[PDB]
Structure 1
Amino acid sequence: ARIAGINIPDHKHAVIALTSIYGVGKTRSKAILAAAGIAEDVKISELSEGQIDTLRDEVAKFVVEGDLRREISMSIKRLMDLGCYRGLRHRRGLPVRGQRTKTNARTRKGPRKP
């Protein structure tokens, strides 16, 4: 009950169980179980290890956790370093996509505290 160097959930129907893994949403997760041939219903507890390993080999195909984090850290890095507008926004801790900044944008700007 540990894959990708983490994943230790249970009772959850495998797909959700895998959603726990950073780097995988339900879709990709379902896809994994799809190729694995594992029924999504099975609680990870029911899941045989002789199957879990297949799942490890399965998830190996899809970029996850560690590399993913580093990777995103690298793309954002590029941004803030290149000096592209997106980078500026990230350096300013502000919405990038083009959202209203005059009012909301609390997510990026954090709490209304200041």
Structure 2
Amino acid sequence: VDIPREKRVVISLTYIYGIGTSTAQKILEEANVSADTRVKDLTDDELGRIREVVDGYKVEGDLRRETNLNIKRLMEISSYRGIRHRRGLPVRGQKTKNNARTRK
């Protein structure tokens, strides 16, 4: 709905919280965020065509659109083996020690 114009659009969804392994895997890899869009890249009908990917739940910081908060009810199990992002600093029993150190 508010994808960036004037340049390539495959930086639209790659690094957004809430959506991961559909950001650059289902919304850009499976679906279409344009990869060769100039300032004039058919922003007359294509712009409105790709707005049905913004209509599910709570998307990309757009928290009424696509993705996020279906795990809300799931939050209350008193459980461990989904904390990797459900609780996304993974404190799911693994290391934040000396050398377990790459991502978050």
What is the total number of aligned residue pairs between the two structures?
88
| Structure 1 equivalent of residue 37 of structure 2 | 42
Q: Which amino acid is 1:53 matched to? A: G
Q: Which has the higher helix share?
A: 1
| Structure 1 equivalent of residue 31 of structure 2 | 32
Return the match for 1:82 from 77, 84, 89: 77
SS in 2 for 1:31: coil
Pair 39,68 (structure 1): closer, same or farther in 2 beyond 3 Å: closer
Identity of aligned residues (%): 22
TM-score by length of 2: 0.52
Gaps of 5+ in 2: none
Which has more radius of gyration? Answer: 1
**Are 2:52 and 1:54 aligned?**
no
TM-score by length of 1: 0.49
CA root-mean-square deviation: 3.9
Shift >4 Å, 4+ stretches = 60-64, 86-89, 104-108
Gaps of 5+ in 1: 109-114
